[PDB]
């Protein structure tokens, strides 16, 4: 499906970033951000 992660440092930034939101602002806020991201990505033809 997916190749080997072409850029794991990039991926780590994303995962760390959402980790920080969860710890500092909580799961409800991380849920809000992920919902807004999915809706944004759909505009660019990404599911």
């Amino acid at each position: 499906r997916f190749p080997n992660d072409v850029d794991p440092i990039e991926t780590r930034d994303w995962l760390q970033a959402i980790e920080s939101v969860i710890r500092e602002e909580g799961v409800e806020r991380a849920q809000y951000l992920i919902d807004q991201l999915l809706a944004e990505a759909r505009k660019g033809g990404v599911n």
Partner: protein, 55 residues
């Protein structure tokens, strides 16, 4: 506005730039596909302090 005119950076580097008042439009990205890396922000800030401590 072609792709080179746009900033490419992870949410982590965008947050770092927000926290330190860095306009990523002014930072040259050296990561894959021109992405702005932590080291690009560090170099930019180091140089800004230099210019400011020499005004």
């Amino acid at each position: 506005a072609e792709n080179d005119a746009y900033v490419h950076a992870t949410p982590l580097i965008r947050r770092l730039a927000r926290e330190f008042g860095v306009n990523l439009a002014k930072v040259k990205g050296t990561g894959r596909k021109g992405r702005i890396l932590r080291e690009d922000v560090q170099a930019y800030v180091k140089e800004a302090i230099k210019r400011a401590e020499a005004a």
